[PDB]
Amino acid sequence: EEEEERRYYRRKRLGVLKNVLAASAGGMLTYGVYLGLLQMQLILHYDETYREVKYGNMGLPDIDSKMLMGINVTPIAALLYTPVLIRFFGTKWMMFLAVGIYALFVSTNYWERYYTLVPSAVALGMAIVPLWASMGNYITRMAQKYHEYSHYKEQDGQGMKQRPPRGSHAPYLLVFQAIFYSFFHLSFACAQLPMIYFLNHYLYDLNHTLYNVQSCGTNSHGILSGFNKTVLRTLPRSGNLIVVESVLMAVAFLAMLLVLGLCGAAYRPTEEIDLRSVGWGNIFQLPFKHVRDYRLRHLVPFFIYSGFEVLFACTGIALGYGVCSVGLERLAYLLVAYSLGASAASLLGLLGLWLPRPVPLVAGAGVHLLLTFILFFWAPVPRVLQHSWILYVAAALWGVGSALNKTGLSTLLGILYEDKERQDFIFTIYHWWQAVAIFTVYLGSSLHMKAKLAVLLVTLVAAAVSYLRMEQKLRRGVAPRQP
């Protein structure tokens, strides 16, 4: 009897595929609801009318600043407690804890007070890094399990009992990472649905809210230097706000429940008791001992640039250039165009599989670089509605570059390290450095310009990637050993 094992392995492969799909869907849904709520709060809490009639003597800007601080600073302390937490709960349970903390943060925006928003922001900043760490580790582990299942089904006795792939799981990991990043980028588009369906119809034209903007673009001198005091024409009824927040809470609840139920268990407690053979007095120092690795000293600038570029695409293009010609009427449209461009770039990078590994990466390092040039010389006049497709195509190309960069980084990190602990540590370091870059951009706000720093960082990243490639081809043969 051989058809029984065939059907068993096919069902296991289908289960792995649907688990990856459900994990990606839940991650993108919670990221989208979080981004939408954050954008709605940032737009609604920047006006004298709403702040003075709903709260007044409550310190709303102070609350917003404290929330931003607790979100952008706490990841630093989150690094110190993420390895033991991700290895104590598990690879999937960490995602559930993270989406639960995200739902808690979404719920804490109902009453909107200090003692309920500060701890929620602290928890969100504490869980933002372990969320991405567990997500990447789970994606890589499920891709490796898919590959070894397929290779054990097609090769029974030819496949070794230990270490099957030998670096042959790239076509099976890239296909999963492509759809994962496509969903993660469509999350940015889904985040703009509440603003379009409820917030885009309550703000007046740009003739009054974009009046004190004498110069923008290259002469930014800050995130938002010139801007009107109010932005809402009419005040939204509490019924609409409460119903849209209830819809957001319900969709976050659905995302969390689909993450919890449609994932099952892919941990194998044998791996748990094998990991417990290492101890707790060494796991706290393992990521600090992996600093002596040679590839990290050149991949860290790559991660810092990834964080810088994602935070510049989230704010620098929408609030720096897309706000000049058009006001807040077409900001969500610019974001959805960026999201569609990134989703197309996901499949574009998926198509580039026959070529070797470091082909699109440096290619990306050029394309958006060209955009940087366009972001350095060209400066759009704010008080004219002459050209609108230039911002659209710029956002599309920047999203393409960002998505291909992200998928190439993830594929490189998945193919460079294959051990479970190795992948966990690499993803933890990557996400810690991404959070550090986010915090640096947060501190780098209200500055003159951030394009020169961007081009310097991307040049250093291209140089470091070329150096790492040319030294890996010459067979350096260096790797740390900390079992």
Partner 1 sequence: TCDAVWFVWWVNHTEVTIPYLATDVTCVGPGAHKGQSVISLDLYTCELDLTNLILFSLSISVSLFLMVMMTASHLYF
Ligand X SMILES: *[C@@H]1O[C@H](CO)[C@@H](O[C@@H]2O[C@H](CO)[C@@H](O)[C@H](O)[C@H]2NC(C)=O)[C@H](O)[C@H]1NC(C)=O
Positions touching partner 1 (CB under 8 A) are 47-50, 52-54, 56, 89-90, 93, 96-97, 100, 103-104, 107-108, 110-111, 116, 229-230, 232-233, 235, 237-239, 242, 246, 249, 253, 256, 260, 269
Q: Which residue has the tokens 């960069």?
A: 405
Q: Which of residues 352-381 bind ligand NAG (CB under 6 A)?
A: none
- Contact between 292 and its own copies by CB under 8 A: the answer reads yes
Say whether 221 sits in a helix, a strand or coil. Answer: coil
Q: Closest distance between ligand NAG and the C-beta of residue 329, in Å?
A: 11
Q: Answer with the entry of ligand X, partner 1, ligand NAG, none that 97 interacts with (C-beta below 5 to 8 A by kind).
A: partner 1
In the structure encoding, which two tokens stand for residue 277, read together? 């053979």
Q: Total binding residues for its own copies by CB under 8 A? A: 5
Amino acid occupying residue 208: H
Q: In the bound complex, what is the minimum distance in angstroms from residue 474's beta carbon to its own copies?
A: 21
| Residue 480 beta carbon to its own copies: minimum distance, rounded to whole angstroms | 12
Q: By CB under 6 A, tell whether 49 contacts ligand X.
A: no
- 288 near its own copies, judged by CB under 8 A: yes
| Contact positions with ligand X (CB under 6 A) in 204-243 | 208, 211-212, 228-229
DSSP 8-state symbol, 235: P
Q: Does the protein bind ligand NAG through residue 207 (CB under 6 A)?
A: yes
Does residue 279 bind its own copies (CB under 8 A)?
no
What tokens does 80 get?
A: 């110190």
Q: Which does 162 bind (CB under 5 to 8 A by kind): ligand X, its own copies, partner 1, none?
A: none
| Residue 244 and residue 194 in contact, taking contact as beta carbons nearer than 8 Å | yes
Distances (CA, A) of 444 to 107, 129, 372, 454: 30, 21, 18, 12
Structure tokens at 423: 């992948």
Tokens of 56: 């007044």
Task: Write down the least CB distance from residue 229 to partner 1, Å.
Answer: 7
- Binding of its own copies by 291 (CB under 8 A): yes
- For ligand NAG (CB under 6 A), the number of binding residues is 2
Burial of 410 (0-12, 13-18, 19+ CB in 10 A): buried
Q: Residue 111's binding partner, choosing from partner 1, its own copies, ligand NAG, none, with beta-carbon cut-off 5 to 8 A by kind?
A: partner 1
The nearer residue to partner 1, 206 or 232, going by C-beta atoms, is 232
Helix ranges, 312-418 (H): 322-325, 331-351, 360-377, 389-416
Would you give the end-to-end CA distance of the chain in angstroms? Answer: 41
Q: Which is nearer to partner 1, 5 or 272 (CB)?
A: 272
77 binds, among its own copies, ligand X, ligand NAG, none (CB under 5 to 8 A by kind): none
SS3 for 426? helix
Residue 203 DSSP class: B
- Determine the Cα–Cα distance for residues 150 and 144; give it in Å rounded to an integer: 10
* Closest of 320, 232, 326, 322 to residue 40, by C-alpha: 232
Of 207 and 238, the one with the shorter C-beta distance to ligand NAG is 207
CB 300 within 8 A of CB 433: yes
Helix, strand, or coil (residue 302): helix
Map the footprint of ligand NAG across residues 400-419, applying CB under 6 A. none
CB of 384 to ligand NAG, least distance (A): 8
Compute the Cα dihedral for 450, 455, 456, 461 and give only its sign.
positive
Query: If contact means CB under 5 to 8 A according to the sort of partner, which of ligand X, partner 1, ligand NAG, none does residue 385 touch?
Result: ligand NAG
Task: Write down the least CB distance from residue 285 to its own copies, Å.
Answer: 8
The region that residue 121 occupies, defined by phi over 0 for left and psi between -120 and 50 for alpha, beta otherwise, is: alpha
Among the candidate windows 30-38, 267-275, 287-295, 355-363, which touches its own copies by CB under 8 A? Answer: 287-295
Contacts with ligand X by CB under 6 A lie at 208, 211-212, 228-229
Contacts with ligand NAG by CB under 6 A lie at 207, 385
